């Protein structure tokens, strides 16, 4: 299915960041994934301190990787990201754009009698 | 309904808490079971109204800076007076400033409370001081 | 409701458990 990999990378110089992205996207491809896009969300201060691979981090590079993969690839990729020392935190979620939002007519009022009864 | 009782036969009666109603009342009459409820809940409404006026700067710049906090607000059943309690400050010097501004504000606040037509008939508010053991500070003054 | 029936059953089971322990 279609997944979204939210990737926080160790704050590094441009050459090492590109090598990490290439090494990470190739890991997806080796597991059968079809990578759709790569988005840079920018380098920023983390909302809190994150300890990863015997190091403390206060800034990180936020990236998104939109890709399709078989269901069995997720488990194998999660293990791959845990061993990459340049990844602070990497999570794979189902892509939000696949889930279609249902239409809403509005806010229907709730009867008070039901509230106390329930 | 809930365990809280709402079976009153005169549930549609128009609640009239005014000073004139107290005089035109049967002396034999005693407060009914759910008659205290309206009093307990109306006094709570007055607490809500007063609390918002204190924290909104539009009502008064002097009042807003004071940051007064209301400890208690209980109206009287007579409908002649209202009891409001604000928490005292440590500094007796600061206490004088708060009471002075509150004493003069109350007169305008009453008119501001009349702006709420639901509570248009508001008895004069008696801004009592409590929650800070004012006597204890008074004792140290002596 | 009252628990008087529960209390009778309570005592019967307490005494039975105690009897079994003793013997």
């Amino acid at each position: 299915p279609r997944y979204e990999l939210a990737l926080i990378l160790k704050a590094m110089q441009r050459p090492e960041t590109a090598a990490t992205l290439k090494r990470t996207i190739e890991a997806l491809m080796d597991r059968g994934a079809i990578v759709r896009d790569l988005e840079n969300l920018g380098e920023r201060a983390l909302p809190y301190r994150i300890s990863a691979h015997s190091q403390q981090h206060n800034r990180g590079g936020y990236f998104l990787v939109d890709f399709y993969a078989p269901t069995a690839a997720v488990e194998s990729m999660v293990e791959h990201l845990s061993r990459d020392i340049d990844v602070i935190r990497g999570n794979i979620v189902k892509h939000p754009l696949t889930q279609e939002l249902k239409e809403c007519e509005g806010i229907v009022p709730v009867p008070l009698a039901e509230k106390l009864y329930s | 309904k809930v365990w809280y009782e709402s079976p009153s036969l005169g549930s549609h009666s128009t609640y009239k808490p005014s000073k004139l109603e107290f005089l035109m009342r049967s002396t034999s009459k005693k407060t009914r079971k759910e008659d205290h409820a309206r009093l307990r809940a109306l006094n709570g409404l007055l607490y809500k109204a007063l609390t918002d006026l204190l924290c909104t700067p539009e009502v008064s710049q002097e009042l807003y800076d004071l940051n007064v906090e209301l400890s208690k607000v209980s109206l009287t059943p007579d409908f002649s007076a209202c009891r409001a309690y604000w928490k005292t400050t440590l500094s007796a010097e600061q206490n004088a400033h708060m009471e002075a501004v509150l004493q003069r504000s109350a007169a305008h606040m009453r008119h501001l409370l009349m702006s709420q037509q639901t509570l248009r008939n508001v008895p004069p508010i008696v801004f009592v001081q409590d929650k800070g053991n004012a006597a204890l500070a008074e004792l140290d003054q002596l | 409701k009252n628990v008087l029936k529960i209390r009778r059953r309570k005592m019967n089971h307490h005494k039975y458990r105690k009897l079994v322990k003793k013997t």
Binding site: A6, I8, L41, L46, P47, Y48, I50, G60, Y62, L64, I88, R89, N91, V93, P96, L101, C104, E105, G106, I107, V108 | C55, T56, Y64, D65, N67 | -
Partner: protein, 97 residues
């Protein structure tokens, strides 16, 4: 029969149902600016729907988005990120003095 008799139909003067400020909009865990508008500035506490005015569906989406963003490294937990303090105040809560 008679032309002036009432006719059966649906209410023509009926007004549309109310909608929350977020009705019809996608709530993403990466949109921390939006999510921050529904947490306490001082404590980071998620506001109840009686404060946010959101409907049950969007209150849930916002909550799940905040919780996801917090633990994935996009949003702080214990306070509102100060960058977002000057955004539109859409919550019915009054704090300061």
């Amino acid at each position: 029969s008679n032309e002036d008799l009432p006719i059966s139909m649906e209410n023509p003067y009926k007004e549309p149902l109310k909608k929350c400020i977020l009705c019809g909009k996608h709530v993403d865990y990466k949109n921390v600016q939006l999510l921050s508008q529904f947490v306490s500035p001082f404590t980071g506490c998620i506001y109840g729907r009686h404060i946010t005015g959101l409907c049950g569906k969007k209150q849930k989406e916002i909550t799940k988005a905040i919780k996801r963003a917090q633990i994935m490294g996009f949003m702080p937990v214990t306070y509102k990120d100060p960058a977002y303090l000057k955004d539109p105040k859409v919550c019915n809560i009054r704090y300061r003095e």
